Amino acid sequence: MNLTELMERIPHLREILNIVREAFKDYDDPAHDISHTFRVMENASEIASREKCDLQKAIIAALLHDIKRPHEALTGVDHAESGAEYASGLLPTMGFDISFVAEVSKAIRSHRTPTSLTGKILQDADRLDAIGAVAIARVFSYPETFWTETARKMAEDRYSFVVEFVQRFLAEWG
Amino acid sequence: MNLTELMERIPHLREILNIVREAFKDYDDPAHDISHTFRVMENASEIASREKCDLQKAIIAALLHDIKRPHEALTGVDHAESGAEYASGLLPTMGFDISFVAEVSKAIRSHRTPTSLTGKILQDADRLDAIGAVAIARVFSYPETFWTETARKMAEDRYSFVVEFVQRFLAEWG
Ligand SMILES: [Cl-]
Ligand SMILES: [Cl-]
Ligand SMILES: [Fe+3]
Ligand SMILES: [Fe+3]
Ligand SMILES: [Fe+3]
Ligand SMILES: [Fe+3]
């Protein structure tokens, strides 16, 4: 799904994306910048769709999970705790119900085990970002551990691509 | 083949490698540094072996083909012309015969069409270095056009890997 499609399915998505962009304004650590959050949300979208789980919870949790990363860089306050508290304050103002907000907040709180489906999907989505083509590109610019079967398959696929990349690099280097 | 194996088959290889290293000492342009020459020689080794062509000529031509690149950077004198003249002077002193030296020299002279098997292999080996895993890594740190069937297959393989890399990058980026 593209963003237009996500915005058709997820309430307040545009405003949440906006808030996330604003939070990350001038936080450019390539290891933790905003593009990571967008890739995590793409991974969460794939996983939740294929697992037949709650997409709204998964997407929102992914968008918000590192929203307090810049704040941690300034203060040393743990971003998972801070991000969970932030989600609990923000989300009720957008009409999300108590159980929805509690699940999203707990997922963020647990992301660095998680106990909910949203938390498991979030953690998988986050950790998948350490592997693949973009991860390879980042290194140069500077699978059984996953909860869900969909993430495990994605991890296997990305890992096998990374292995091939290394093998080729070494074979070509001589 | 590893270098020990090449040194078992190719006269004066160690001394030639030594001379090449010395030529490149303090020439660090990542687009034209010594590691390119070594990758070209690896490509030439594969191609000449599989094509049942003269390995000695192919290897030596690959090692020497850009030996005057650093000199071109300083003077503007074309490295293909300069490299061919250099090979014609150096190689007879190592006991290579007139026809061998002329072929290697012409191959270097023509590498930027070539008319000999050595020149065709050299050009393929050189141009293959623009694609593949190491080429991808270089970009981030900063097939039917090939003469031989072996290079065409290698080019197809590397190009299909590059395409997959791009596709994955884009899919992951969101
Ligand atoms: Cl959780
Ligand atoms: Cl030629
Ligand atoms: Fe995090
Ligand atoms: Fe994260
Ligand atoms: Fe050249
Ligand atoms: Fe070259």
From TrEMBL, chains A, B:
SUPFAM superfamilies recorded: HD-domain/PDEase-like (SSF109604)
GO molecular function: hydrolase activity; metal ion binding
The protein's name: Predicted HD superfamily hydrolase
Tree of life domain: Bacteria
Gene3D superfamilies membership: 1.10.3210.50
Keyword field: Hydrolase, Metal-binding
NCBIfam families for the chain: HDIG (TIGR00277)
SMART domains, per the entry: HDc
Residue sites binding Fe(3+) 2 per the record: D66, H79, H111
Name of a matching Pfam family: HD
Sites where the protein binds Fe(3+) 1: H36, H65, D66, D126
Ranges of residues in domain HD: 33-131
